[PDB]
């Protein structure tokens, strides 16, 4: 019971159904094997993968990461390969600094293509705030906020 609860609660984005059963390996003995059967969330038809956006990432490796993530049969495809695709792309940006460049959403899904969309943000507004704290015997600091520094 607790194995089923822990496995169902740990990977709820990918599996969400585990059934566990036991069966005796031999008569006149209490030894028995236990089997775990998972039915993952499936997605009913994905043939191709496309990556859109991403004007900073060159075409030399988008091709190889689209080639790596391919399944074999088109008809019953698990959700988690979706989570594999962005796990490439995010990592690439996280290897190059860039903490605001991420895979936003997938917009294909009706013509059989899984199409990731990459969002790349840019700086718009720079603002400065002037604060000072106050010395008391309290553990929490209160502040005096100014629009302009002295």
């Amino acid at each position: 019971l607790d194995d089923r609860r822990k496995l169902e609660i740990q990977y709820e984005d990918y599996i969400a159904e585990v059934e566990i059963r036991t069966e005796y390996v031999d008569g006149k003995s209490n030894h028995q094997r236990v089997v775990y059967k998972f039915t993952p969330h499936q997605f009913r038809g994905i043939n191709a993968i496309d990556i859109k956006g991403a004007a900073l990432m060159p075409a030399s490796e988008v091709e190889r990461i689209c080639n790596e993530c391919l399944p074999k049969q088109p008809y019953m495809v698990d959700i988690a390969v979706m989570d594999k695709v962005r796990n490439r792309i995010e990592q690439w940006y996280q290897s190059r600094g860039l903490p605001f460049c991420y895979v936003g959403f997938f917009d294909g899904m009706d013509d059989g293509i899984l199409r990731a969309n990459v969002t790349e943000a840019k700086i718009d507004n720079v603002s400065v705030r002037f604060v000072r704290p106050k010395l008391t015997g309290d553990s929490e600091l209160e502040y005096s906020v100014y629009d302009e520094g002295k």
């Binding site: 709820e12 984005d13 969330h41 997605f43 959700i79 979706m82 997938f106 899904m109």
Partner: protein, 48 residues
């Protein structure tokens, strides 16, 4: 006290937003109660 903790556990199983955000297009998360019957008479759809 045990009842209040069980209500928090029930919220985590039933209204989990990481599953709610992807329910149009990636998953199927619908609000139902417990399953009451396994078999119904065939003309039940006439109530709709």
């Amino acid at each position: 006290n045990q009842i209040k903790t069980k209500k928090l556990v029930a919220r985590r199983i039933k209204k989990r937003y990481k599953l709610l955000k992807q329910m149009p297009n990636q998953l199927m998360y619908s609000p139902t109660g417990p399953l009451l019957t396994e078999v119904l008479p065939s003309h039940y759809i006439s109530v709709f």
